[PDB]
Symmetry: C2
Subunit: 187 residues, 2 copies
């Protein structure tokens, strides 16, 4: 039985922060669904790369649950995630079933919006710290990847391989993560 991941893709998402985790998780043999927040239609990312989702979020939700829910960053993408009642429901249910939630760069600010994981240690992009920390509901970290139990966060494009491999390690173990890492030519 393979592990499954839901990646929620909204307009204005950071395309690197979307594609690196999708690709690395697929290299790990995880079954990844790229779900469009707004529907099935192509999604215009922050730097104008246009990605076609595998399914709408509505449809993907019916095929869950997932071993991880992944929230890419990009400020406008994170805002769209934060404003969505559907994302609220998915994240609450994932938290309620003790499933992993992974968010990168401004992505973790959607956890704040939906009151997910309060009391956890988290990181974000440096420019998203103040937003994430409004109210003091989390403890901030400058680690490149932070994992406090079932809340896994990371900082930016340059930490996205580390983030993705941390998801792989959490789901499939350290040995699979190491095997996936070697062909990537990381430093």
């Amino acid at each position: 039985a393979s592990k499954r991941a839901l990646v929620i893709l909204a307009k204005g998402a950071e395309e690197m922060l979307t594609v690196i985790p999708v690709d690395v998780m697929r290299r790990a043999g995880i079954k990844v669904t790229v779900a469009g927040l707004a529907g099935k239609d192509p999604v215009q990312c922050s730097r104008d790369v246009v990605i076609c989702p595998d399914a709408s979020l509505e449809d993907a939700k019916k095929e869950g649950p997932y071993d991880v829910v992944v929230l890419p960053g990009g400020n406008l993408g994170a805002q769209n995630l934060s404003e969505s009642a559907a994302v609220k429901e998915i994240l609450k249910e994932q938290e309620n079933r003790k499933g992993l939630i992974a968010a990168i760069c401004a992505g973790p600010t959607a956890l704040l919006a939906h009151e997910i994981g309060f009391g956890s240690k988290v990181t974000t992009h440096p420019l998203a710290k103040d937003k994430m920390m409004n109210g003091g509901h989390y403890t901030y970290s400058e680690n490149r990847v932070e994992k406090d139990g079932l809340i896994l966060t990371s900082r930016g494009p340059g930490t996205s391989f580390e983030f993705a491999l941390a998801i792989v390690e959490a789901l499939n173990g350290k040995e699979v993560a190491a095997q996936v890492k070697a062909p990537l030519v990381l430093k």
Copy 2:
């Protein structure tokens, strides 16, 4: 006047090796055209991410010339690039006008196919070395990014930020590259 880049996107291209350079070049203010080898239609990448190109290669060619032509990797994508007469023509013309050509991972093997840049120092993904070196037409390097004049090559997903920033430096200078790099959270 901004610099312009042509990124040639074929079926089976490595989506990280496509998106990271597109995004980082756009962050640098380069005008990037993602051109579909096969036409305007969406492109299925190696790990099944589907990207919609900005234009067909046929149309993009008419809007050149470009300050850089970028060839992503992915073995099947590189093979498609290598089999295309249109790519041959674009690369020969770029070489003839003394314009930069940048290729990452198996991407440089399309330079071999089209007899581009012989006598240059190059790198590739480790698994693409033997293919690239057939005939001894290039000198191999293990540097993460190699630039021998107007032929710029790199090794893999984990070197793609370095590759993209090397393109930025070549076109827009070291200071712009440094400014684009800082918000990425590189190690």
